[PDB]
């Protein structure tokens, strides 16, 4: 297992993790907007 | 291969700063809601 193999696998882990963190943010941003709409309605 | 690694790293660092900014924006929004639900 070379140093380059380690770097590649770290990078791969990171890109996979970033997409999941983004998805979680999008799910939560929808939830906050739903709460904001509930508190803002007439 | 090194160019691929570098460009991947660069993409990642840019994305991390944007994800942080989104979190900070949303943390303010949640705190605003929390203040609304906690006020006297």
């Amino acid at each position, epitope marked *: 297992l070379s140093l380059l193999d380690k770097i*590649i696998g770290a*990078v*791969d882990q990171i*890109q*996979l993790t*970033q*997409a*999941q963190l*983004e*998805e979680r943010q*999008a799910e939560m941003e*929808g939830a906050v907007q739903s709460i904001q709409g509930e508190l803002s309605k007439l | 291969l090194l*160019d*691929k690694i570098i*460009g*991947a790293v660069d*993409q990642i660092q*840019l*994305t991390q700063a*944007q994800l942080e900014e989104r979190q900070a924006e949303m943390e303010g929004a949640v705190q605003s809601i929390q203040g609304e639900l906690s006020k006297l």
Partner: nanobody
Amino acid sequence: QVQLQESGGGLVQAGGSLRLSCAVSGIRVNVNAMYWYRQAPGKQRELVAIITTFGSTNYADSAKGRFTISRDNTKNTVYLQMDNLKPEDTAVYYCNAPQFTDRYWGQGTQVTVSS
């Protein structure tokens, strides 16, 4: 600038298949992770599939084994193969890189699935 030219959508029957294309300029798809999204009318944009720089893939739960993301490095093009389509997949599909989703979106390609 980054250019995103989505194509390959259309009208398809349930159980049918599509292959979407996004021709990219201004960044290399073999250097950057690339994402496909979809947006149904009046709903939030949903992440559908991702391919990393070194070729790992992941899919939203709604894909459930039906979608396959791939790329051609020479054509600098990202593909989404979509099998066994369902009416619930009707949406505009967009390709992007994560660092530009706050910045620019292409026109997308309309996919309409009818029974």
